[PDB]
Amino acid sequence: ATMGLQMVPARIEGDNIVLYPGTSRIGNNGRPANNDPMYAAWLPYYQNRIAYQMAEHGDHVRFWAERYTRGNFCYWRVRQIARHNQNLGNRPERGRNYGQHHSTGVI
RNA sequence: ACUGAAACUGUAGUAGAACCAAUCGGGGUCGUCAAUA
Asked: This protein's superkingdom (predicted)?
């Protein structure tokens, strides 16, 4: 399970692989550097669902996210989502502390 | 401006001599499987 911390979200575009570390930056060992947040954002899906019907693996999307903290690390908790062509709407605010997933209000 | 008649294509000969349906294999035994929070 340690090895997952040095995986990066990726795609292939035509015939090149692409990487999407996004706002996070790739640390030397491949881990997200300097305690910056996980490369991918986290979508609540089987509990505290962030609904638009629930999105699906092919969905191209636009979304708000919030920086959340847990223990040794932090991550972009998705807050609200729309299909890409649709309007995302207004900025959400200070989410619930979902237990040890603590809000920051950094959105 | 008088059909020739009569005559067994049969008589003797072992489709056989030689060759392995066989060569190798313990009815045996350990750590995997799924990916995140």
From this structure: Bacteria
